[PDB]
């Protein structure tokens, strides 16, 4: 007979354990990019010197070798980088084969096929499908996180704490991220396939899923219903008829399942910690290390001047004028990755916010914003830095407004009241870790005021 494959053993439990994907409740082969996996492939006979094997992997509806959503690679004796297959051993008709993906591979579901050239004939046969995720264990991955204990918290932990209350009195709630529960990883991959980007141009969306910046920004849009029938419909009205009270959720799992099982119709209703809880589940699943941030006295700046503006007339009466506001607290997310777009100094934590506050490029989406950038007030960089800088470090300015002459002038400044007790759960405990000093220089330093001026300088290029 011509050479043909009889069976393939994916060594699923072995490879999943090596790829730190073994925790997911799922039968599938789940792998991380840039890391080899080993399979046993039982042929009908031994390989001839006339005979060739070629593997073909593809992802998404319009695979392309140029877009790196398709790869064709021969079984060889040498690793090439890129996609490769290395023959490690022959034993009878069984081939032991080590297959490697590149660190730059797009994440998602892949199909693998084998093409055999034998006796002047050609056969092709689907071997199977796998899921490829980001690889925080791999030094050359953009999402690389070198510390073991932090990786465990920010990738592998499926229970969380979210800080709530006020700047007088901080509480906490638990949140079940549940990224390992049945179907949740599948649903989180779904989200990418339902984005406006995917609908406009699936070939390019899928090619862009090698970039955590891209995936992160997309998720920040798609977790909210606005624009795209994403996951959660916001409601701050106090009246939640025809839905759940935002406070009754205690995890992401029901929300994501209910979204799928309603035919991908917005789940009613969420507020900011519910968006953030759900976004966190998505990020951890896909392998972007992430965590949940609470900012107390969080500024909503609606006119890009880095100040919350309050108005009085010259006789001292309060004016109903201006749209700026200050939240008791607001919850968002950080994701961990390099920023090849910005440069070496701006890697690490990046703000992502799914709560629909301001349109960014026409869409309710937010981030990624370099937390380092924000602290140094480089608010000309992508993405959404002015808005986020105001959230944590707006001045609160009282204005005098003389309605006769249309003149407003500045009465007073409070440069320290915004952005207090910025909080994330501690690694490996339920302690509140304070990360205020990561977002800004210390209130009342010279640096803090220098950056504030610098930042303000860059709004006006």
């Amino acid at each position: 007979a011509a050479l043909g494959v009889q069976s393939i053993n994916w060594q699923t439990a072995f490879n999943r354990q090596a790829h730190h994907t073994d925790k997911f409740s799922s039968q599938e082969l789940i792998l991380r990019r840039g890391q080899n996996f080993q399979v046993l492939m039982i042929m009908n006979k031994g390989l001839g010197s006339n005979e060739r094997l070629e593997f073909i992997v593809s992802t998404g509806p319009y695979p392309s070798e140029s877009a790196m959503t398709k790869a064709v690679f021969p079984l060889s004796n040498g690793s090439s980088g890129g996609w490769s297959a290395v023959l490690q051993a022959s034993n009878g008709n069984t081939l032991t084969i080590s297959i490697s993906s590149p660190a730059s591979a797009p994440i998602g579901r892949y199909t693998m096929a084998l093409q055999i050239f034998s006796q002047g004939g050609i056969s092709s046969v689907k071997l199977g499908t796998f899921i490829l995720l980001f690889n925080p264990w791999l030094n050359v991955d953009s999402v690389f996180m070198g510390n073991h204990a932090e990786r465990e918290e920010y990738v592998q932990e499926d229970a969380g704490i979210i800080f709530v209350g006020s700047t007088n009195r901080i509480g906490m709630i638990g949140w079940n991220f549940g990224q390992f529960e049945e179907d949740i990883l599948s649903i989180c991959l779904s989200i990418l396939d339902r984005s406006l980007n995917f609908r406009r141009d699936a070939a390019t969306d899928v090619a862009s899923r090698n970039d955590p910046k891209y995936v992160g920004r997309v998720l920040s849009a798609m977790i909210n219903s606005n624009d795209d029938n994403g996951v959660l419909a916001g409601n701050w009205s106090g009246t939640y008829t025809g839905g759940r009270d935002p406070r009754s959720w205690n995890g992401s799992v029901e929300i994501l399942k209910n979204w799928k099982k309603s035919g991908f119709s917005p789940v009613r209703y969420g507020q900011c910690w519910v968006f953030a809880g759900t976004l966190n589940t998505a990020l951890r699943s896909l392998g972007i290390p992430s965590r949940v941030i609470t900012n107390f006295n969080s500024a909503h700046d609606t006119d890009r001047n880095l100040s919350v503006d309050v108005y009085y007339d010259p006789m001292g009466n309060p004016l109903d004028k201006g749209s700026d506001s200050v939240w008791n607290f607001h919850v968002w997310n950080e994701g961990w990755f390099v920023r090849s777009d910005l440069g070496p100094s701006y890697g690490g934590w990046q703000v992502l916010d799914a709560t629909p506050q301001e349109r960014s490029q026409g869409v309710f989406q937010c981030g990624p914003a370099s937390v380092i950038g924000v602290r140094e007030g480089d608010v000309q960089l992508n993405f959404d830095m002015p808005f986020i800088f105001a959230e944590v470090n707006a001045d609160r300015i009282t204005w005098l407004y003389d309605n006769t002459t249309g003149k407003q002038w500045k009465n007073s400044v409070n440069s320290h009241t915004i952005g207090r007790y910025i909080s994330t759960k501690a690694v490996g405990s339920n302690a509140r870790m304070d990360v205020t000093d990561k977002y800004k220089y210390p209130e009342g330093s010279d640096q803090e005021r220098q950056v504030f001026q610098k930042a303000l300088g860059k709004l006006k290029p």
């Epitope: 004016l319 109903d320 004028k321 309605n403 002459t405 003149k407």
Partner: antibody, heavy 118, light 113 residues
Framework: QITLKESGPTLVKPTQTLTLTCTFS??????????VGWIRQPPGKALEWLAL???????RYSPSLKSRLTITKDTSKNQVVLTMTNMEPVDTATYYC??????????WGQGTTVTVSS | DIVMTQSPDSLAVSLGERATINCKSS????????????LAWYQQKPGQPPKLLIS???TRESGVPDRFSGSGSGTDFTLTISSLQAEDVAVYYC????????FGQGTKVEIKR
């Protein structure tokens, strides 16, 4: 003690520039929130607001006459100066200056008569 | 420009009697934000500059006798002299200061005798 006092030429030939001075006391035009304004009144007619200057050198003008008007201050001399170009017989009027704070124009000067004629 | 139109143009009343003056503005001078009417009344006795009687439609200035009282809101205002005195003879202007300054045309108030 808030008093304002106007001065300048009481005759101007057409096309020329009237220049009026307001000398005030009882209050500072360095105080925040304070403004002094100019108003004129053509004989047996209604009052017409001309211009206004604030403590910080912000100016306002009658929209119709803006292109012709220029208001300036000298806090050292306790003076506000009004300049009106291209004077014409219609511009014959009594000219006033007045103090403003937090309501309207609340204390006025005596007024000075200005006749436009060759 | 907001246009201030007073009425009547002239009034003659006996000593002690009530004299009323309407003023109407082309737009509303009620600022909702502070719920204040940006509307003044002045008195000009012949040969003097004008003198402010009333701000914010209804607040009397210091020293103004209580026989003077302002009412109205929005675009309709009234100055009412409760007991006309010989020396109250003057021209009364309304003025809006909601959008810059515009005056009414004036109303002459004279003693009937």
């Amino acid at each position: 003690q808030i008093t304002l006092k106007e001065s300048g030429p009481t005759l101007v030939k057409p096309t020329q520039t009237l220049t009026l001075t307001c000398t005030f006391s009882g209050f500072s035009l360095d105080t925040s929130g304070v403004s002094v304004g100019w108003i004129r009144q053509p004989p047996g007619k209604a009052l017409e607001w001309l211009a206004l200057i604030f403590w910080d050198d912000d100016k306002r003008y009658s929209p119709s006459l803006k292109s012709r008007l220029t208001i300036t201050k000298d806090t050292s001399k306790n003076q506000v100066v009004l300049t009106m170009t291209n004077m014409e017989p219609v511009d014959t009027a009594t000219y006033y200056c007045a103090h403003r704070f937090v309501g309207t124009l609340d204390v006025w000067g005596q007024g000075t008569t200005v006749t436009v004629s060759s | 420009d907001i246009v201030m139109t007073q009425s009547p143009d002239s009034l003659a009343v006996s000593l002690g009697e009530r004299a009323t003056i309407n003023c109407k503005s082309s737009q509303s001078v009620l600022y909702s934000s502070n719920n204040k009417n940006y509307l003044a009344w002045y008195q000009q006795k012949p040969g003097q500059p004008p003198k402010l009687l009333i701000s914010w439609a209804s607040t009397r200035e210091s020293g103004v006798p209580d026989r003077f009282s302002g009412s109205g809101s929005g675009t309709d205002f009234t100055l009412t002299i409760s007991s006309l005195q010989a020396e109250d003879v003057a021209v009364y202007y309304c003025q809006q200061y909601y959008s810059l300054w515009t005056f009414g045309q004036g109303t002459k108030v004279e003693i009937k005798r």
